[PDB]
């Protein structure tokens, strides 16, 4: 029905790094011109770009219609921005299908982007401080990792998840260590090479083309995993070494209808069969992939086991763990290339990223069925299926 | 298939007015509550919750599922916000219909909500000053109000399309007065009681319940807009009379599907037919909505004289007389209860705050083809087509 | 030896009061100006302005240049701040006479300015905040009211002379009432009228011409004193009713030899006999006028009950009458008029403003032998020995 | 009668350096304890400590308090600091002399600190933003390097004297090379040794001692110079490189009477024989030196060939040579050891850093009679004379 006939990421960024600069809207504009070129789509036959991002504070009016436009999509087209914290860039996809499904759109490039790096920091002083010192709030912290009910940071909600699961320090370690060696072995071998696209940091003193995940560690050890401090615990289990981080990129697919690929002699990366979303306890919104992806397998009539590829986004070592027990699946199958701990967490971007990584990898090994799926701030998951063609 | 089955809205307040220190989702919350209430729905049953929201920074992760949450819907539902600036509170619902059309959901609220009173000052502040001033910038103005290809207020597109549509000065005051007076009388004769839930301010010297819409001027003269200097063009047209002003509300409605509400016993507000949307040159945004209500009409098989009733958000008195001059639709069936100059533009809530004012009076009056439309920042705009049942 | 020709200060504006915009260098150059005018003296004859202020922060290079280059002191002239908090003003007069005493200069106009009111909030941001919250700082507090050494509020510091001098509530609400009463008193009566020179404030809806010192409440009860709560100690003593305000102003007093008065036929206000400055505990720093009197009063060559008046700034109650009781001098002859409790209390002006209380007083009761005195912030004290000619 | 019994200073840090995050004060209070050493005074002998300061926001009250009692200088002793722009450095000398003169005090400490690294950006903010953007006001710029009276930078008003004594870009670029040339070998062959003592910047993975001047750029070309576009006029003659530096740093001197040093033993570094202070314009701020040499020189009795080394500020290339160029003084006896273009600009410690330089070039080459001066911005100039023992 719909289909996904092409997709492209930039690199993911480090904290303040190659993008420390750079507005995500100058991201999603280079994805969205990807996505175009490799489907043989023009500009011009774009109905709608739906692009999520979670922190957008300060980058001016709605700018996913600023990539749109800069991309050179033109202006009879629309473009809206949407928030379903890390759940978002995957939840674009489904909307985008939506859009086709209904018979609303016929074209649309959905994903999601972040620069995590240039959000700012604010404070409300319409009113007034009469007296005395005020916060100013950094509003990545505050509108992205900080829960909004018990006030803690997600890394907290890690903390219940390992408590309650009682996962080891040495076990979260492995699987860090793990993600990075999958990822740093995916990344020499050219394994991400298919799926980004360059981007050029603009200069003064010279321009600079990024084309290369900078977050990515090389010889990584157990040893400095374990040497590493609790980040949120004094007594704690999860660290800076395995959680994800803190990064900046985006991440797009170019949706159409299996007819329209079909007449356009386009070979599509795979075709939609379903998607899910559902809510769990805020406390542990690490599982939240857990009944997403139960859900989604439902509505697509599949067994965990028809699976032969998974992408599920390594929020913190811990909550990957608890997901990967409950449900499953042969580990060997999931985040085959490495994940967020090693890659990074551009929060509204990782949806679409990791959908990029399942897509190439199901395509490279010829993979038939492939899911994606990703736990969401405040107690959330969204899974999506994929068959290829 | 699609029906809107019961609806609501908090009052609009004026800037730093009665919601001066009001989070948005605490308006959402009593929405959400009141359209569960009004249609016999429990929050329980409620899937997911839309809010389109144009400001949200500093107020905490995702606070369209904060409103959900406080409402009383469950943690297994789901929850996220959404960014077409001024589109967003229709396009909120026409995103909830496609939920239950392609059977992801059965019982969607969808709607906006906005605080452009809490929307906080900024600065991005990593890589540091070095030296030299900086500016700590309006997020209200920034993200809200400034178009980002041109650098300039939408008040300037509103100047743009007052010379290209060669509107007085004096045909635009014309409308502004048109508008108070129209909503002063709607007020007075309790036509906006239906729409408005109370919202309750907490206090700690006295809590304060606001049921009517305060931003309204009553007694409103022609003289009194007259003498008004121009805001945007000092040798221009555009004025703080003739434009819409700056406010906070939320607005909801309950979606199912009409088999649903029939089983329910509900006696819906209306059937959504269409809705579309559509983009224009970022220059003229105003004019979003004479393509968008063109292409929402054609979607429904209407012609524009079939239309009994229709609510078309007034941004600014010289996009308003342009559609209005367009689309040729009998101005006497148009915001027939006043509008925005008079009611108040909190962004991200008015599309749905407009529907409420189309729903109540197309019942009260047995008006049975409506349609909603708004011009959008960045050039686009979106209608939606509602029948009753 | 070295002589006050003449002298003159603004009224005293409470914080964010008549002088909320004034900077402090405007409020200066009117009191520069006003001291020529008195002893007759023009511009182009001074040698040297020397201002006293604390806060000068975001007011531009060197304010008392500015200050003295807006009251029409030719560019040959120079000009300097200083700063020694509340003994700056008093200090500043010093300073004036011993250039003159050195044979450097021949003509000083020596004071103290501040605009609490003008004060901004600040951050270092050169570095750049990598992450996190960070705070803004009112420099006001932290530059003018924060002790260096040990953290805490000047009032803190209030509250140690309280509990080390017994000083209960009860007498410190009856002092401060009692400052309020002399304060009105003297007021009404128009004994401020002579050392007040007039400042027009600038306006765009009009002038406002300030004359009056507006901090001084009218009715002043014991009971209102009684019921106001601890400011910094929630089971302390000391409150905003019984310690001085946050207050803005400009005072000065123009220096030459007493020879060179009577070559022009000036009759001054007053001769400096000495001066004084000691330190003592930080943590008890009201307790400075008492060494530094004392000093004073041993370089004079006068005891105690010499003096015929009095003035000892009244930053706290509690200060202050441990203060008397120490020094035990006659408490009727001790701030006639009233002190900052009722005036206010602008730091760096405070002196400079105080000593014109003193003189103009002296000179309408024809007493002969006077002193001033203030309380320095850090652990320090400032006198000054006047005899009237 | 009054002599510099001993001196000291700490290295000259560059913008943003190796004093990046040092408090003024901590750099103070390493001065005064060097000075007590050398001296062979305790701390507890001291009367008071003068130290001037153009930039104090944000480091909390009183830092010339701060830094005596971090020296562990008694409480009992008093502190304050001034404010004559790059004047104030050498001006505190002046003052803390004049305390003596007039029997005030025995034993001073003065002299000059300034971080303009650690100056923060500030805004008032206590009115409050009703709406729109607003600045954050780099205090460094603003109450350091901009004139109050036209606006602009001190670059500016280089670029008056410039053109007003027809300095060529070639002769500018001429003299600064060789101010880093003289300085860079003065660096080598040790003569900055004597006056600098060691600053330990305190850390958490090490202590870093700094104990030479880091702004010395080695190996200076005329090419180089040459290649510099113009830093303040798009077609001006000033560059960075001709102009002095943004800097951190700390210098002070020991005061006492001669008698009083003859008592201890002390053989002093010098007599001060004279200082003076003149305004000039402050469009032409930097031909201060002239009219306050002349002044010192006259009042020292002196004339201009009398005088064996010179110490003139290079606040610019453009107004150095013009001071050398009217006063006519050896240019070989000016500026021995390099400058400030080379050292670097602490503004408010300039003056006592100069005064250092001075002094112990003076007893390495046995130089009978020495002069220290600077332009001070809103124009003005300082100067004194100083004869060895
Ligand atoms: C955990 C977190 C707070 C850490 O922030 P941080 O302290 O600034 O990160 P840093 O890398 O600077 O600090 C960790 C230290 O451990 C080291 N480190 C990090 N990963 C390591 C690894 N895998 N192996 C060895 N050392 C490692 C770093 O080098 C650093 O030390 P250094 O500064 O000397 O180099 C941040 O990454 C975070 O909040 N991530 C979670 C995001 C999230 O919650 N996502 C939303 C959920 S869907
Ligand atoms: C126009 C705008 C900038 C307000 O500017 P402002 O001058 O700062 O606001 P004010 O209300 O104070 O305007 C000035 C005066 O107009 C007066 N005024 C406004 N409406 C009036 C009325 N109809 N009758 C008489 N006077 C009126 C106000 O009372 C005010 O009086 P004052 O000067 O004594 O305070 C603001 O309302 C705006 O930009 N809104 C546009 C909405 C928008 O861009 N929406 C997005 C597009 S979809
Ligand atoms: C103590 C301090 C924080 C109080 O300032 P503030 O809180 O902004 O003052 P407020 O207006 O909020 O005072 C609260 C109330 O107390 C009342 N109050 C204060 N002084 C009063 C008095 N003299 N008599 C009766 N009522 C009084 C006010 O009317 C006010 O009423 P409101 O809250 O309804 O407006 C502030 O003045 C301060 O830091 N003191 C400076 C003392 C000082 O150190 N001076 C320099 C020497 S080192
Ligand atoms: C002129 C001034 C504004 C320059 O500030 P700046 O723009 O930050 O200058 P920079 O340090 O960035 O210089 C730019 C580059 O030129 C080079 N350059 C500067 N001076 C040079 C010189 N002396 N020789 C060779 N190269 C030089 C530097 O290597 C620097 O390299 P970068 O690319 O890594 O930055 C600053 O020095 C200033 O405000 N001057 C102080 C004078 C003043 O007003 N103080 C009081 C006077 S009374």
Not at 16 to 35: C, Q, W
Not at 133 to 157: E, N, P, V
Not at 177 to 189: F, L
Request: charged share 20%; aromatic share 4%; proline share 3%.
């Amino acid at each position: 029905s719909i289909v996904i006939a092409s997709a492209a990421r930039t690199a993911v960024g480090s904290f303040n790094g190659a993008f420390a600069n750079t507005p995500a809207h100058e991201l999603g504009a280079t994805v969205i011109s990807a996505v175009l070129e490799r489907a043989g789509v023009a500009a011009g036959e774009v109905n709608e770009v739906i692009l999520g991002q979670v922190l957008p504070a300060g980058e001016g009016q709605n700018p996913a219609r600023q990539a749109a436009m800069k991309a050179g999509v033109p202006q009879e087209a629309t473009a809206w921005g949407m928030n379903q914290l890390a759940g978002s860039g995957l939840r674009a996809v489904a909307l985008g299908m939506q859009q086709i499904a209904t018979g609303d759109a016929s074209i649309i490039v959905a994903g999601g982007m972040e620069s995590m790096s240039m959000a700012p920091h604010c404070a409300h002083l319409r009113g007034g401080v009469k007296m005395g010192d005020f916060k100013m709030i950094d509003t990545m912290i505050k509108d992205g990792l900080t829960d909004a009910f018990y006030g803690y940071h997600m890394g907290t909600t890690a903390e219940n998840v390992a408590k309650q699961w009682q996962l080891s320090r040495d076990e979260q370690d492995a699987f860090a260590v793990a993600s990075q060696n999958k990822a740093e072995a995916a990344q020499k071998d050219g394994r991400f090479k298919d799926e980004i696209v360059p981007f050029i940091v603009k200069g003064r003193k010279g321009d600079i083309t990024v084309d290369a995940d900078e977050y990515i560690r090389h010889g990584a050890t157990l040893d400095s995993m374990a040497k590493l401090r609790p980040a949120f615990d004094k007594e704690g289990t999860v660290t800076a070494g395995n959680a994800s981080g803190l990064n900046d990129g985006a991440a797009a697919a170019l949706l159409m209808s299996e007819a329209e690929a079909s007449r356009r002699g386009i070979q599509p990366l795979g075709r939609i069969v379903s998607w899910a979303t559902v809510g769990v306890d805020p406390k542990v919104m690490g599982t939240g992939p857990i009944p997403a992806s139960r859900k989604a397998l439902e509505r697509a009539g599949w067994k965990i086991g028809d699976l032969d590829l998974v992408e599920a986004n390594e929020a913190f070592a811990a909550q990957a763990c608890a997901v990967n027990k409950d449900l499953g699946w042969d580990p060997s199958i999931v985040n085959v290339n490495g994940g967020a701990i090693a890659i990074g967490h551009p929060i509204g971007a990782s949806g679409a990223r990791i959908l990029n990584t399942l897509l190439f990898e199901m395509k490279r090994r010829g993979a038939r069925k492939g899911l994606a799926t990703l736990c969401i701030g405040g107690g959330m998951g969204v899974a999506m299926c994929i068959e290829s063609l």
